[PDB]
Amino acid sequence: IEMAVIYLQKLLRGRVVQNMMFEGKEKRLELILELRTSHALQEDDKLVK
Amino acid sequence: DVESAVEDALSAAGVTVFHDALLAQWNHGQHPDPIYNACFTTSTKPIRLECSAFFSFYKKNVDYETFKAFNDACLVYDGRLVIDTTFHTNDIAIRAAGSLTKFSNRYYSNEWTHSNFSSKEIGFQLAAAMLSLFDPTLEPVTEPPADLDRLIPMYKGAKIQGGILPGSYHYLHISKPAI
Amino acid sequence: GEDLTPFYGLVSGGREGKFYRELEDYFYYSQIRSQGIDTMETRQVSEHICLSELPFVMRAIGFYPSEEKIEDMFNEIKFSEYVETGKLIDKINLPDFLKVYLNHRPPFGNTMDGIQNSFNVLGYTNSEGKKAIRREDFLNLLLTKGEHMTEEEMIDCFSTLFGLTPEGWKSEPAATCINGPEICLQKELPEEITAEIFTTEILGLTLSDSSEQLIQ
């Protein structure tokens, strides 16, 4: 019972938080894109950048 | 030489001159309004001073209120406001210029900005660009080539600063844009 | 081969898939979150996220660790280097974060099955026989059991999921909203709730089934 409840709680919390992050990423996307223009994340920095 | 001249004029006035210091707290921990007494830190010693009134010229900045109003806009802000070298913001419909503005890092010239140049030359060329959207008598013009996106083009309109100085001197200084 | 090549191969579209770019953005966005969205300085970012962001990024990609899983992963990162260095460490790099995700994630896309099982344990079979839960019972259980929720927290979550609030919840205020969610708890949620309804609420993603036959 408790693990089933945790399963639901997990899916609720995850969905809420992911929606927060994707939304924020939209507004910031212009900022984010320019940041990527400047410099890059370590893997894709090392090859791609 | 001129700085030394001004400093000697300040000596003859008896103005109280402090290099190196940094602003420790007026009214320390006591209620700040009004100020009455002030402290200054230094490389070696405490300072205290008596301050009926306090005038700031510490740092120019974008206004906090307007900075926030921009960040609400989600116009790209990198501590100063981001444009291409043809004044486009991230909105095709919104464009910006003057020392509040700065170019993408790709230009690799975060030292070089509209802050560097004359004001008038900036406004004049910005208007010339924006007229091309408005004016039917010149032909309508394309969006920039990326080849322009490669560079900040060298303006030349000299930048003026000028002042009257302690002991009733006049002062005038003009510059080529530079780091 | 070697280096990321196997793990890249595990990611759909590897180094150029729209998924992979979507993930990479979250590393930057969460770096901004760690800096704070409001700052007057130059922005700065480099290689790393700070571990509190890691649960946020993981959820942002689309995998849903429990609080216990979060604790486990923080232990994993802190201690794994510990004995050689002597040190706690809390700056994680993308390549290792990717390894963590790939190990921790469900071994495919996320699946209905645990949802069905959870309803099947919790619910009665309804008039249609479907395993189903009554709205107030469902809410009360979600607060009381499992890992506990505050009532106001749960109300905020529901209001967000229905989209009653302003979005992102991370720059501009809201408090005019929350009174609406009180009645929305009745008006939004049906009296009987089912896996079908709950998954329609959580998921726009039709999490279609995986395949294997080519895999060695």
Side-chain angles (χ1 to χ4, degrees):
Chain A
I1 291 158
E2 65 91 349
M3 289 205 317
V5 169
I6 279 180
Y7 210 94
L8 274 288
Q9 288 167 334
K10 283 159 62 187
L11 293 179
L12 284 164
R13 286 183 167 160
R15 178 55 48 248
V16 163
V17 167
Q18 182 164 30
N19 185 268
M20 302 300 92
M21 301 297 277
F22 168 69
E23 165 44 40
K25 204 210 87 158
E26 295 283 55
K27 263 52 165 289
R28 309 310 164 196
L29 198 184
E30 304 306 329
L31 170 64
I32 280 173
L33 172 57
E34 272 299 340
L35 260 292
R36 178 175 290 118
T37 311
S38 73
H39 81 79
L41 186 49
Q42 196 183 56
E43 150 38 31
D44 293 89
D45 150 47
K46 279 181 177 183
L47 176 61
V48 204
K49 199 52 147 183
Chain B
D1 310 328
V2 172
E3 285 150 15
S4 180
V6 180
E7 288 131 34
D8 281 354
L10 293 170
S11 309
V15 177
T16 329
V17 181
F18 300 85
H19 299 291
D20 191 55
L22 238 181
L23 176 66
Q25 289 29 266
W26 26 248
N27 304 6
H28 341 305
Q30 294 79 350
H31 177 80
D33 177 23
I35 290 169
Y36 30 77
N37 293 294
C39 303
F40 266 95
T41 81
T42 74
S43 297
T44 64
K45 259 207 174 185
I47 295 168
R48 209 176 201 89
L49 287 179
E50 291 148 40
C51 41
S52 314
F54 200 101
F55 285 116
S56 181
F57 304 103
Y58 172 65
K59 279 191 170 187
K60 293 188 182 181
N61 208 71
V62 183
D63 296 332
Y64 170 61
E65 302 174 359
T66 291
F67 154 93
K68 161 163 163 51
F70 294 175
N71 283 275
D72 300 338
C74 74
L75 292 178
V76 177
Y77 201 77
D78 174 39
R80 297 196 172 126
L81 184 69
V82 177
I83 61 176
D84 75 12
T85 58
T86 50
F87 330 122
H88 308 74
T89 70
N90 58 283
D91 191 340
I92 188 165
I94 311 172
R95 304 195 192 175
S99 55
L100 64 135
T101 72
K102 187 182 178 195
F103 301 107
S104 171
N105 303 68
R106 72 178 165 266
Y107 295 84
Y108 249 78
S109 48
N110 291 12
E111 315 95 305
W112 278 82
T113 126
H114 281 204
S115 52
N116 306 33
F117 308 96
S118 168
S119 303
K120 281 184 170 181
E121 184 148 306
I122 296 163
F124 182 73
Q125 188 156 4
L126 167 65
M130 300 268 61
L131 269 167
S132 82
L133 305 194
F134 322 144
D135 170 38
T137 69
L138 226 181
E139 299 191 327
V141 187
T142 71
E143 291 170 49
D147 297 309
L148 302 186
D149 204 16
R150 304 186 196 298
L151 69 107
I152 27 174
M154 308 313 301
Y155 316 119
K156 276 185 178 178
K159 199 184 184 190
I160 306 184
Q161 288 191 348
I164 305 186
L165 288 178
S168 312
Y169 295 83
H170 316 68
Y171 158 87
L172 178 64
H173 164 61
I174 300 188
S175 63
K176 189 180 194 171
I179 299 174
Chain C
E2 297 191 41
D3 310 320
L4 289 182
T5 310
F7 307 99
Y8 258 131
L10 296 178
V11 178
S12 48
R15 180 163 36 222
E16 289 80 17
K18 292 176 184 177
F19 168 86
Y20 182 61
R21 204 171 303 292
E22 175 73 6
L23 181 151
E24 198 206 283
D25 298 338
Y26 289 108
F27 201 101
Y28 274 21
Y29 177 88
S30 62
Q31 253 267 10
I32 285 73
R33 291 204 44 53
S34 76
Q35 181 60 98
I37 321 190
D38 295 350
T39 223
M40 324 306 288
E41 301 93 320
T42 54
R43 319 317 287 238
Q44 57 76 29
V45 176
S46 54
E47 303 182 302
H48 307 138
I49 58 176
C50 305
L51 312 188
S52 51
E53 307 297 4
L54 177 152
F56 281 111
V57 178
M58 284 294 186
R59 287 175 170 183
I61 301 148
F63 129 75
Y64 311 113
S66 66
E67 321 317 317
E68 182 164 307
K69 282 284 191 173
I70 291 172
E71 180 60 25
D72 305 332
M73 292 184 294
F74 290 168
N75 279 260
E76 185 151 30
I77 292 169
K78 282 176 181 178
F79 298 118
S80 49
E81 300 180 80
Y82 171 88
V83 79
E84 296 192 6
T85 61
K87 309 168 202 172
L88 290 171
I89 297 186
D90 68 346
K91 283 187 179 181
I92 177 167
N93 70 78
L94 161 72
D96 291 318
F97 171 100
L98 178 64
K99 299 175 189 161
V100 185
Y101 159 69
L102 291 174
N103 285 286
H104 278 84
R105 64 185 191 160
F108 301 93
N110 177 52
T111 74
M112 279 57 262
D113 193 72
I115 321 172
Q116 306 314 99
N117 301 340
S118 301
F119 273 92
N120 291 356
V121 165
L122 299 169
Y124 61 64
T125 52
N126 83 330
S127 60
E128 305 195 328
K130 295 172 175 175
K131 277 279 188 166
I133 318 175
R134 279 180 156 274
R135 175 176 60 208
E136 299 75 18
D137 329 23
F138 161 85
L139 289 165
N140 177 69
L141 287 163
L142 283 165
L143 303 190
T144 49
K145 296 196 180 185
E147 180 58 285
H148 195 282
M149 309 181 69
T150 289
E151 182 169 25
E152 299 187 339
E153 160 204 345
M154 167 279 289
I155 286 171
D156 164 29
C157 296
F158 277 112
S159 72
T160 302
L161 292 164
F162 300 130
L164 306 186
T165 59
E167 77 292 343
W169 206 253
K170 281 175 172 176
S171 161
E172 46 281 326
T176 295
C177 184
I178 69 171
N179 304 113
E182 303 169 36
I183 284 176
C184 110
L185 288 174
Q186 304 93 67
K187 308 311 174 179
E188 295 288 324
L189 292 165
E191 184 169 321
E192 293 190 335
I193 300 165
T194 65
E196 316 181 323
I197 291 162
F198 178 84
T199 53
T200 49
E201 306 333 292
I202 299 304
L203 294 175
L205 311 178
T206 58
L207 293 176
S208 51
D209 302 316
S210 62
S211 56
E212 183 183 322
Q213 287 72 15
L214 301 175
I215 299 170
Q216 283 54 55

